[PDB]
Design a protein around this ligand. Sequence first.
Ligand SMILES: COc1ccc2sc(N)nc2c1
Length: 185
Amino acid sequence: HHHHHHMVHITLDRNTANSWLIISKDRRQVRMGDTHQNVSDNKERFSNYPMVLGAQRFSSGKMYWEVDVTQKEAWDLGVCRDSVQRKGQFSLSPENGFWTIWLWQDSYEAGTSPQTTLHIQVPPCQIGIFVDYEAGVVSFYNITDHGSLIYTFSECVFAGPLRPFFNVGFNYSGGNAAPLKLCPL
Ligand SMILES: COc1ccc2sc(N)nc2c1
């Protein structure tokens, strides 16, 4: 891909984070804490899952960013509508305002309804996310494997401003403590 030149500087929005997340001072890394992080609750925070949004809102143009997933067993990445549900149980699907992929139990899947099996030969340590708002496209790239395509959502019906979307995953196993990191340009 030649999407690198639409690079955007993403930062995490603390106010949207699940109350167990620890976001770095620079707002570029997030990990699961082993306890509640001593913040007040609010209607914006994701309650059920270890999710957080980027601060940036996109309503036009082409945007690209990269995320480091090194040594994680579970995570979700992509974009979502600014108005997605925050509280209670929900599935990650376009119908609910999400355009995501994930790793779970040694398989990679795209968040379609129902979910789509991904075919990844080289387990990624860094993922590139490309959004073309006008074209209705969200694409995922394997930066570890020379930028190879992972998945394209096309004919997307965004129906609102978009925000970068992250899930660090639970750490029941003790093998998923590592952070998600936004990679430098
Ligand atoms: C790549 O794995 C990492 C990186 C940073 C940290 S801080 C912590 N408690 N666990 C980890 C694991």
